[PDB]
Design a protein around this ligand. Structure first.
Ligand SMILES: Nc1nc2c(ncn2[C@@H]2O[C@H](COP(=O)(O)O)[C@@H](O)[C@H]2O)c(=O)[nH]1
Ligand SMILES: Nc1nc2c(ncn2[C@@H]2O[C@H](COP(=O)(O)O)[C@@H](O)[C@H]2O)c(=O)[nH]1
Ligand SMILES: Nc1nc2c(ncn2[C@@H]2O[C@H](COP(=O)(O)O)[C@@H](O)[C@H]2O)c(=O)[nH]1
Ligand SMILES: Nc1nc2c(ncn2[C@@H]2O[C@H](COP(=O)(O)O)[C@@H](O)[C@H]2O)c(=O)[nH]1
Ligand SMILES: Nc1nc2c(ncn2[C@@H]2O[C@H](COP(=O)(O)O)[C@@H](O)[C@H]2O)c(=O)[nH]1
Lengths: 303, 319
């Protein structure tokens, strides 16, 4: 029994929506190939419930899924099972706009009308790129794009695979663009601080053996090249640090690489014992300039 | 276990889609201690606009409305019908024949007028309570769902009932009876049909009787008595007693001929399933199975009068 109990209607609608659409798709054959129309397609459901099932859901709401066939395919290409995805969203209200599913596997980010537009605009080339790199990429993994209507107000959402681990606590996260950027006096307050270029560069730092250095750098190259060719820019490399010892005070440093896809063990002959999480993000907006600049600044944190 | 909702008509795919959709949603809704007054004014409504998506069987654009869904779920429970079974009977394969049957012949789906839907609403409170206090023991139609489908901006109303006929045993002759002094016979056209719906003069003209035996006859007549008094209580008139006759020997032979053809238990049924079914008296000529229930009670020389005339006639139908 799914109640879709959530601290917010919007969330309940979200949960109801992912549930409804995944189920509906389970009735749609997996096609031999995507077609041009699949990139212009959507599903739209409008609910109007008089005196019925109001305990958690609004009586009236709308839910629109963009390009369901394309995103279902992406899901499979990223090695994600539809039923798992559905359960991640619906089993328990997602939590804290930038949300996470209760199990921390998927990030749910609110975006704007033009974000959704930019997404339509790159979706075919992004799909094609994912195919060609066999899913092996530091780019965001777009799992679904939705538009909710709750109380007459439209809200757009994009679901990605979480960059950070879903079980290993992060102790320090960085946000790198490779180009005047430090963290703010107010931002430096809370526990989960988000540093920028300066704070890390000036701080001094990431040891992932050569084997990892090569792949990573190799993956980052083709990626930002693709981004450049899209005339896209303004993206950052989210970096997470999980120092194992600080965690010791079901084991530590232990993770499932099929789930924490961006995770990386520290090198044996290295200083401290850590797991790094690293991926690109926020690419829905000099570009070639930006790429090499970006690519250069990231090659330098890898002993 | 993909469900394509494939069907000869788009109306049917939407029906399958709708029953499937509502039943699943209901499965996420707790089962209440009792029903609350509004449950009787309640409805669910979903509108679909798919674009360039999921178009092989469903239309891209349709509406589906379920009336008083908390009540009909409860009516299902009280009739010993599990929701998953109901769902399965409607969605596993297209209904077949405006008058449909589920592919497995358990449920009848009737296309009704707006008036009819209005009348289900008027009588719904009292019908439920009547079902509660008779524990589901009644010759009345057992209502399992009421729906409004919209395809092509055209609205179609449907009521689902339990089939009066068996879902397996063949019927070899049926009657529609009222007991109205007005001559009721089957048309020369009806007669030429494969399984004509005969009527009173016909039944009487044929010396037809039904040998069910004492215990059966009493339980039947007792149901009929409260049933038609209930109907008289409401304005309700003009309903009929559907009478289907199954010939056991004839079936056995027909079955036999069926294998021979194809190749190129007996007179028995489950009372929990063929709910209106009675075996003939050990002392009847032919070994038969009868199916008898009230139908067409959705329409408001009077009612009280009608009940009495209806009651007397039926009770004289058997031995
Ligand atoms: N290119 C393209 N843009 C779309 C499509 N659907 C929605 N968008 C864009 O995304 C934004 C949201 O549109 P809405 O879905 O709210 O109608 C709008 O800017 C709209 O133009 C589409 O199929 N193709
Ligand atoms: N846990 C998690 N947080 C993220 C992810 N992507 C972005 N964030 C959070 O969002 C912030 C970056 O802002 P954004 O670029 O998302 O607007 C960072 O502080 C980071 O904590 C993700 O995949 N997982
Ligand atoms: N459509 C609709 N008809 C109603 C409602 N309540 C009463 N009626 C109808 O109004 C008339 C009295 C009848 O047709 C009755 O069915 C309602 O809530 N909705
Ligand atoms: N009594 C009653 N009648 C209704 C209700 N909803 C619809 N009806 C009746 O059923 C018919 C169909 O209503 P619709 O659902 O097409 O608006 C209408 O003629 C209306 O009289 C209700 O909540 N209560
Ligand atoms: N098999 C079956 N046939 C029915 C049932 N109710 C009515 N019928 C038949 O279907 C036709 C339409 O029913 P009516 O419109 O008279 O209620 C009638 O000719 C009647 O013989 C039922 O519950 N099961």
């Amino acid at each position: 029994v799914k109640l879709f109990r959530a601290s917010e209607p919007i969330l309940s609608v979200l949960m109801w929506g992912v549930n409804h659409t995944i189920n509906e798709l389970s009735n749609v054959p997996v096609p031999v190939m995507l077609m041009p129309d699949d990139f212009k397609a959507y599903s739209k459901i409008k609910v109007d419930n008089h005196l019925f099932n109001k305990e958690n859901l609004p009586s009236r709401f709308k839910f629109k899924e963009y390009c369901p066939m394309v995103f279902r395919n992406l899901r499979e290409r990223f090695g994600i099972d539809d039923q798992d995805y559905q359960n991640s969203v619906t089993r328990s209200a997602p939590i804290n706009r930038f949300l996470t599913t209760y199990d921390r596997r998927f990030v749910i980010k609110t975006v704007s009308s033009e974000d959704v537009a930019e997404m339509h605009n790159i979706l075919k080339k992004y799909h094609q790129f994912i195919v060609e790199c066999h899913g092996n990429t530091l780019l965001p993994q777009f799992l679904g794009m939705y538009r909710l209507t709750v109380d007459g107000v439209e809200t757009y959402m994009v679901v990605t695979r979480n960059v950070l681990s879903h079980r290993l606590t992060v102790h320090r996260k960085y946000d790198l663009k490779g180009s005047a950027r430090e963290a703010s006096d107010k931002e430096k307050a809370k526990d989960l601080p988000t540093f920028k270029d300066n704070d890390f560069l000036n701080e001094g730092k990431l040891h992932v053996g050569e084997e990892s250095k090569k792949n990573f750098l190799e993956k980052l190259k083709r990626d930002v090249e693709f981004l450049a060719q899209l005339k896209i820019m303004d993206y950052s490399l989210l970096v997470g640090i999980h120092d194992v010892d600080r965690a010791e005070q079901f084991g530590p440093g232990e993770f499932d690489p099929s789930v924490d896809v961006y995770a990386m063990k520290s090198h044996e002959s290295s200083p401290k014992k850590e797991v790094y999480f690293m991926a690109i993000i926020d690419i829905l907006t000099n570009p070639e300039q930006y790429s090499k600049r970006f690519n250069e600044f990231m090659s330098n944190i890898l002993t």
